[PDB]
Amino acid sequence: AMKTLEKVNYKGFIWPLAVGIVLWLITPWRPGGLSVQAWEMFAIFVATIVGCITKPLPIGGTTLLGMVVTVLVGLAPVKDVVNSKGVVIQTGILSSFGNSAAWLIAMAFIMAHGISKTGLGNRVAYVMIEKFGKRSIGIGYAITGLELMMGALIPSNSARTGGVTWPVVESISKSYDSKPNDPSRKKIGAYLDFMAFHANILSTALFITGAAPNLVAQQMAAQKGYQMSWVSWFWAALVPVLVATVIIPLVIYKMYPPEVKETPNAKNWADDKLKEMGPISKPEKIMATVFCLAILLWVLSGFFKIPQLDSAFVAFLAVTLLLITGVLSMEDALHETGAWNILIWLSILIFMAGKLISYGFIAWFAKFIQSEVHGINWGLVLVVLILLMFYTHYFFASGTAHMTALYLPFLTVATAMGAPLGLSAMLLAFTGVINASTTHYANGPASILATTGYVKQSEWWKMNFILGLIYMVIFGIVGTIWMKIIGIW
């Protein structure tokens, strides 16, 4: 029946491939202390990234192309191999889709389809504008407050943004008539998306238990002789977090205008739509009950380390409850494209970054930074280490690996050059946390918000580079003086 093919932006392929090609040719003159495979992998990673930007063969197919290329040249087998004893050495692309962050995000997308189907979202959104609608900027503050209330409880930054904020924002945007992948986005949506991401960042920095990376930093420091605590993190990050909550949203309102800047007849609008929708129905009560149960189990996961509370299985039982209950049939979920799309591309990028951390790249970077800086005023050392960690998180995709590779070495450096361990450790932890303002594949939240459509990726990278400069300046300077204040040094 069909006659013609589907349009494609072949032009984009010009940029990535070239780079990859280029880098292959540069292999023999690589920095050294390195292999040959590692540079091939670096090149293909850079190419896949440049493709994700240029948007040929949308992100899914592009990362699929990257997996294929990686498999074709002899960098990644398909099936896990063994050491003749049961160990694993060179993982395979099929051992990638068995990640946690991906399936967490996906099941959360399913929960969100259920929400936006039963109507709960439109209700809560009309409510949030009733209470904050006027001065649209307020919503920003609003939701960040929301995040600033949960971060202390929910240790999965992938959920805070996948099962709480993202649906709220989708609903609001569906209210003001701001649909994605259309010029109707700049009204209010993109602003809320961006502010929600950065609020999740602020939260994951404020409380220690906002994300695994911080737990890992605490573990490593303890391995080095410093006992982080729920309270010390808070007492150290309160000040800078307020500074950021005061700066960031304003600079965004000034840099990313929500074309709809005010609505004075809000309360009337919200109350009218409430009265017109009618009371809440059985399905909405069920879905809200399950959402509350999910929140409850997610928060329990922070106090009891039990398989039943992985912070992912909860979403699975949420989905199966929605299914067994009737609110949502499997035939619905199976056509929530965004979920499986994210699954695919996030998993593949994580696998590629894993191959990087494996083949020896990061170890070489560490040995290099260790053998380069020998005698300097340790302040410059902390500064350069902070910058390198931050602008290095690009080459990673999870954050956990980032800390477990480049936290202990950097801290050892800073303490072996004249500086104290406490300050350097807390600084590097805040850095490992605020990395997220670089890309779209850093942590789950970014993997969601910067892909749905409300935000072109160019603007994303640019704005986040700016805000990351700001975050570094603020945390470094302020947090340093405020730690020197309260008996840290």
Next chain:
Amino acid sequence: AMKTLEKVNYKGFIWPLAVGIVLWLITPWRPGGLSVQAWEMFAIFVATIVGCITKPLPIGGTTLLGMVVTVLVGLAPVKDVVNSKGVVIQTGILSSFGNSAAWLIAMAFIMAHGISKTGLGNRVAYVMIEKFGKRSIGIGYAITGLELMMGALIPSNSARTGGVTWPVVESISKSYDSKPNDPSRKKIGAYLDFMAFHANILSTALFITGAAPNLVAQQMAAQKGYQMSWVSWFWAALVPVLVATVIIPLVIYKMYPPEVKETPNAKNWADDKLKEMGPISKPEKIMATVFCLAILLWVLSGFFKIPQLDSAFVAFLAVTLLLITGVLSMEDALHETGAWNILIWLSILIFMAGKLISYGFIAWFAKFIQSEVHGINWGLVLVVLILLMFYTHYFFASGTAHMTALYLPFLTVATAMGAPLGLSAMLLAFTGVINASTTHYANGPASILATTGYVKQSEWWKMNFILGLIYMVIFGIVGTIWMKIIGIW
């Protein structure tokens, strides 16, 4: 916007849960030489199966419920655990979706959507009826011939049925106006579906390289002192395979009537629709080219064991070629529900059967069958072993594990009780091959055909039980006399 929930067949839950419950209560009086966990797992597996039959919460959500239950009671953690050295002991549900058969089938479904979109399928189907249409039964023979031509080349029974037959059959059925999940199926479709499955079985039995299980049997026999060869398998299975190709299709035509039994004006119809459709177009040529490339790489995979030819990565590069070419956009694939549905449920069932083979069930069955049969005429031994293997394949989901667990022991038994090794080995291999006529989760092909919709599962299990009785009788008796003929014993 929505008001009411979605209909559900709660009644079905009556059967599975009960069984599960029942079996928990029977735990303390289990046969013995066994654990406690193993019986819990057996029970939950039986329950998930009974659910797949009764069709509450369609197969996807049901197996999801099974995974959830398995996780809730303390049988399967979510994240792979380690032995403090790097080994894996108790896999997790997330290490399940990293299977090969699943993603193979899924990417094949995507290829099939591309086919049925560009039109290739309608073309080839009108052609196949032009050449065989009259006497609809013929198509059966036709496609089995097709399989009987590929089995010697393609060592992935999951593809022969996922990338060659299934689309042909879908297209034909779309011709005679037989759409799934509707009383319009009994016209011609279900017959072709069933016959195609059983033809793939005949093929995988005919040539040794039709499926991994046979390779594994050859390996184990060699470990025991018998060198199977491409030619011996053929010379032994020719006769019974012809007998089956002559019996099975007829007994099916007599047991599962294709309500449309004949069409006399076929050739005219096919030529008319050809002339009306027009010549082949660029997209169809591209898709056929990629399909041929995929066939070629799949067949190469039989002679060169190379990561690039896993028999799964081929489908991945096929998909990404369809994508980069324009025949098929990622936004299309991402809404081919059947693919991800199969992914989910097949992967989960495989993981559950893996937990069974792990916790000690199968080892206990083997020790039992070994310590029970002590002194008997070895003919009865071979008979009972054949029957037990066959009707045991239920508790497995792949076939590979089935042979690697219950081939060497059974052969050792048969050779330690008066019988020869060659006959017993070849017999048990044919059994490990024809298992597939029991269920819907045995091997990939069944995982596809007996789920699309053309075939209710009740009829499937019943008919396949009958045909499995027939297969056992035929292979055992005939193949035995025909092996005793040609210098096997």
